[PDB]
Amino acid sequence: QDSRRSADALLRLQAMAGI
Amino acid sequence: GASRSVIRSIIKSSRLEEDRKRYLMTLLDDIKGANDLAKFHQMLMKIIM
């Protein structure tokens, strides 16, 4: 759950970077 | 690998708008582990540039 939350944060970050 | 504190300082020292900075800091608290923190730092660089 901690890792999935971390994975989702990276996905949200990726979207901000437009990657 | 940069520590959590170093990464936060980088966000704070960037020229991004305040709300963008605040959301990045919120995302940082959800990051878990050295590997994901390193990936966070890498993507952050693309945004800062």
Q: What is the CATH number of the domain that holds B23?
A: 1.10.8.10
For A3, nearest residue in chain B (alpha carbons): B32
Q: How many domains does chain B fold into?
A: 1
Q: Does B4 touch chain A (CB under 8 A)?
A: no
**Residue B48: burial class (beta carbons within 10 Å; 0-12, 13-18, 19+):** middle
Burial B10-41 (b: 16+ CB within 10 A, else e): ebeeeebeeeebebbeebbebbbeeebbebbb
Residue B35: CB partners within 8 Å, gap ≥ 6?
A: none
Contact, B43 vs A19, CB < 8 A?
yes
Give CA–CA dist B25/B12, Å, rounded: 9
Query: In terms of residue numbers, what domain contains B16?
Result: 1-49
Give CA–CA dist B37/B22, Å, rounded: 17
Overall resolution, Å? 2.0
